[PDB]
């Protein structure tokens, strides 16, 4: 929204956007709602997040290491 710094900037140096969105809300909430499907795409990646959660608990077995 604003990246100025005003005295010592001299370059862009914009990782504020790279750590937040950088194209996020502009390239997604520009159009195309559809009002029906995304929640499943939300939940499937949330199931992947659940799978990311489930795989972190099953780390400690032996692993030969």
């Amino acid at each position: 929204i604003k990246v100025r710094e005003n005295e010592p900037f001299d370059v862009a140096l914009r990782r504020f956007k790279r750590s937040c969105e950088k194209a996020g809300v502009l390239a997604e909430v520009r159009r195309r709602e559809f009002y029906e499907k995304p929640t499943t795409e939300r939940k499937r990646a949330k199931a992947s997040a659940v799978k990311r959660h489930a795989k972190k608990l099953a780390r400690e077995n032996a692993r030969r290491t």
Binding site: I1, R4, F9, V11, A12, R14, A23, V25, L26, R30
Partner: protein
């Protein structure tokens, strides 16, 4: 020309072009910038390099105008977005302010549906 100190350059950065005429907060508009008029058609229209060569050719002969530092008001994504005005800072012409006004509504009127 007019020989002033600073100015307010408003950049309408479209998905294809960082359109900016060297403007002011009073409407004084002199120096254009175009991502298609700087050549670079084909795949090169939405390329960052189209904007950067156009932005140096935007600040062309502006030393005679008196203007060195210019208030960038970038609006939209823009093909360059981080080098268009930065090479101008790398060349030396610093920025008084970069106000990246993202025109975010509260989701009012219905938006189109291109790319079916």
């Amino acid at each position: 020309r007019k020989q002033v100190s600073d100015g307010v350059a408003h950049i309408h950065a479209s998905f294809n072009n960082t359109i900016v005429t060297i403007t002011d907060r009073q409407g004084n508009a002199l120096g254009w910038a175009t991502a298609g008029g700087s050549g670079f058609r084909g795949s090169r229209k939405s390329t960052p390099f189209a904007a950067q060569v156009a932005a140096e050719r935007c600040a062309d002969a502006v030393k005679e105008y008196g203007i060195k530092n210019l208030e960038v008001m970038v609006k939209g994504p823009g093909p360059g977005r981080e080098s268009t005005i930065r090479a101008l800072n790398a060349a030396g012409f610093r920025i008084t302010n970069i106000t990246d006004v993202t025109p975010i509504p509260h989701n009012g009127c219905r938006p189109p549906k291109k790319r079916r």
